[PDB]
Design a protein around this ligand. Sequence first.
Ligand SMILES: *C(=O)N1CCCC[C@@H]1c1ccccc1
Ligand SMILES: *C(=O)N1CCCC[C@@H]1c1ccccc1
Ligand SMILES: *C(=O)N1CCCC[C@@H]1c1ccccc1
Ligand SMILES: *C(=O)N1CCCC[C@@H]1c1ccccc1
Lengths: 255, 255, 255, 255
Amino acid sequence: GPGAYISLNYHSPTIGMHQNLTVILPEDQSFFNSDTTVKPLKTLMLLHGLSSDETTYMRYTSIERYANEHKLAVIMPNVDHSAYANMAYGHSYYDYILEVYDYVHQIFPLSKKRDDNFIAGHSMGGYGTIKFALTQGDKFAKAVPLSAVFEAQNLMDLEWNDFSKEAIIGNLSSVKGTEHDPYYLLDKAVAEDKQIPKLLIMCGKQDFLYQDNLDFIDYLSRINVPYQFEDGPGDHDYAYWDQAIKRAITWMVND
Amino acid sequence: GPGAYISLNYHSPTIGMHQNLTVILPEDQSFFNSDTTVKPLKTLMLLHGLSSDETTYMRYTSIERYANEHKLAVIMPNVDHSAYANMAYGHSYYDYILEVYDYVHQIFPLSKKRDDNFIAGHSMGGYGTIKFALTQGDKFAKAVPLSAVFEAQNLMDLEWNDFSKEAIIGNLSSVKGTEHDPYYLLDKAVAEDKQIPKLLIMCGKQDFLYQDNLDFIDYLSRINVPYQFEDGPGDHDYAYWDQAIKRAITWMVND
Amino acid sequence: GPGAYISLNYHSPTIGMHQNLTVILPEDQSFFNSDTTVKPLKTLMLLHGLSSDETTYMRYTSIERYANEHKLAVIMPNVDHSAYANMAYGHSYYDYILEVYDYVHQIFPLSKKRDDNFIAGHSMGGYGTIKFALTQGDKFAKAVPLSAVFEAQNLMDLEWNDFSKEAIIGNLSSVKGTEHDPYYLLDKAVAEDKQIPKLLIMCGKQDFLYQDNLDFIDYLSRINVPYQFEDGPGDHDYAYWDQAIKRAITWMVND
Amino acid sequence: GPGAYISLNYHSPTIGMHQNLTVILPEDQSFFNSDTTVKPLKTLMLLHGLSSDETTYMRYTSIERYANEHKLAVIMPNVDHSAYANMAYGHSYYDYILEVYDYVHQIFPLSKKRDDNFIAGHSMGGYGTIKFALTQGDKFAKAVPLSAVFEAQNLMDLEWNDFSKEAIIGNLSSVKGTEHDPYYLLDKAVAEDKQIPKLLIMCGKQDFLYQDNLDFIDYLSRINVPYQFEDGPGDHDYAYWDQAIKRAITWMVND
Ligand SMILES: *C(=O)N1CCCC[C@@H]1c1ccccc1
Ligand SMILES: *C(=O)N1CCCC[C@@H]1c1ccccc1
Ligand SMILES: *C(=O)N1CCCC[C@@H]1c1ccccc1
Ligand SMILES: *C(=O)N1CCCC[C@@H]1c1ccccc1
């Protein structure tokens, strides 16, 4: 059965502007009967990579088809070039993800239980995914970084088209040991006894970020944090993220 | 204060196809606070005229600015050339409006109280408005036909671009005494002692439907059904419907 | 290779209403250099099946990614339940496709050469594809029906959700030998020595329309009209059409 | 009469990401006749204020209705909190407006003649308008700042929600005498004998920026640059910009 594709534009109090957001809302019989209470849906926060935006998962994948198969609501915000940080010179986009989460859970029929909420994303969005997994573990039961950047000191110094490192991190000499460093966040999560979401980490074998992914899961192993790592043929493109997100969605909802 | 402009497309079980719908959802503080019970908004079902669709109130008026000012949610469906009827040869568009009503009240924080729900529309949508007011009086406390057609035979017999009367009414030589006839609907509603929503009827003095509007309120007068009628300069265009929907929205939300 | 995803809503003189249309416009370097002449793009008219609309190819396939890879503009109109006919009781939707063709070729940088123009669609849209291929053979060098209905008496008698046979064909007892019949259109095209676009016909072997497809290509063979027929595992769904439109796009832009 | 409302999302080589853009394209009989030469439309570049985006003129005004009346195409980009600058730490948003201009004039039937091209915008967009007027005078015959900031040091030190002064201007303490200072851009344009577009400057008399506007036009008078200034009741809101843009469009298209 099909569902709703929703484009929302609202003025965000956190980032001080109108901003577009897309939502996939699978249909439920209770949505068409006024006398019943809506059945709240499992919900996936889905984070785009660098140069993508709120439309690009819809356009370059079949995610809505996959989400419909599994009665999974999907939230796709736009965070520009922010790497999901509260920027030194820019917008508070880390806070924005938390606002979007609260907003769509207030207005749409989405379950608020931790077991029903997941987060995922690719490249910059996998980096975002792991940051939220390690700082908001109470909000998500599972997190799926796809082709993620785990060594951030390779992302800040990437000279991508119109990308500004300083807008994110200011005049910081190095991200190592800071809240921009997934390894620091991971050590801090373990040290503070925070719940870590269940981890499915995916990366194509031909991706430049592959060795970076191997390094991170090696570290997870050495600090006895469980994870599932899935590799196979694939590069750093939406042809890969199309197939990976289909697999990730099956894994999220089936526990 | 601002709010959310929302474009939705879902596969409707009533009309058997994907269909676009737009929704204005003004901001409430509870929408951004996870620990607050969402406070349901007053809701207007707003019906386009012939040749218009779910986008044209946004485009040709400032309706979102007026609705935000009064924290009024606005639902703008698309019903094509159907005159809001379950068509003889076409779609079940009367049933569709009821589906849309139920659907948005389930998936959005919209009040289900009769006193909080209103309906309005212009030309063919004023005709639609009076039909739902006289057959669904339980669902709406107030109804605002703008530049409406009350004598339905004029709309059926109209020579308009690509418009099909038979699509709506099939073989019927006249609409009088049928569910397509607002005068019969009004007689039936008075005969069955149904609730009739409070009526604000508006039409510009230069509108070609102005005499048709005079005829209807004369009849309302004659059978002692209460209403308010507002005329003044104006023609059958969105310049007038912009000004009229602004007045109409203020009227709905204030008791 | 990225491109533009475009939603257009304009008032159609042919069907007498505002209507949504979507357009994929792959990027060309001449689009960003004002000193260069626009190089017009090859263009595909892509027709949805019954219950789909202008949004559902973007939503349920990765078509924009395939089209970008091959610099192919894609035009995706909405024709409701019309089976791409000028309906007996409804809209002039056959003429509408011709207006859309003219409109987008006037306002966008699209090649007007027959060799650069293709048409394709699935189910009801495969039926529409073969109808336009056999009546507008001068406008398209290639045509691709996917999982199409060739024996039109089956679409007409289908008891699909809210679908109206009479809206399309009126009180015709049978479509055989009329303009609604692809076999009549095919006999007529051959007898009048019209150009028949190169045909690539695709259908999954588990599709209940498979035999219908086998019957039509058998007839093509018996009257010496060339075609390419590709079958294989696949059912009547967007998982199949996603795969098939990717292969169809590659076939149409190469020679 | 009618026209097309267009939403475009393309990956911009200038700002290195997908970005949404809105276009109003009034209808012309040449757009529907494959046999006639497209007559290019007069074109307005319309710039939003701080916290608005590419949707908010459509939502909060009836601009499409006014543009249609005058066969004026309208281009409405999104530039976030950039103040139309190539940001010190952020995106190349000044260059982005030049890209948008070139792109839409390549892919749409828009006049490339200076006399047919205009620019306008409110608050931060009136600031943008005067910056482009004084630096790209060959692109625009007419410019209309609405409720503009002309003394930029106040927009920079405004502590609007989530707004970053340093993102735009870097470590700079003052904007005076830089590319961010309309008075310096004005002095330069005069000293270099550049074409200055015809200026229509509008501001409500209850606006915070009224005095700032009086200061600017006083300086224009003292350096023999012509302008028309229109004030009258009005504050700093879309109620004013709706009425003002309606009059601005009339003034633009009439010679
Ligand atoms: C992540 O979003 N990545 C997108 C494009 C490919 C590489 C880029 C990245 C590379 C190296 C380090 C960090 C990010
Ligand atoms: C209203 O929506 N109708 C469509 C075209 C313009 C007014 C028209 C109408 C006129 C007279 C009688 C019935 C309908
Ligand atoms: C195609 O668009 N048609 C709509 C629903 C599924 C296939 C269906 C069709 C089936 C059989 C005969 C004709 C049409
Ligand atoms: C204009 O776009 N600016 C954004 C917020 C409100 C008005 C504001 C501004 C006011 C005064 C001086 C500079 C900027």
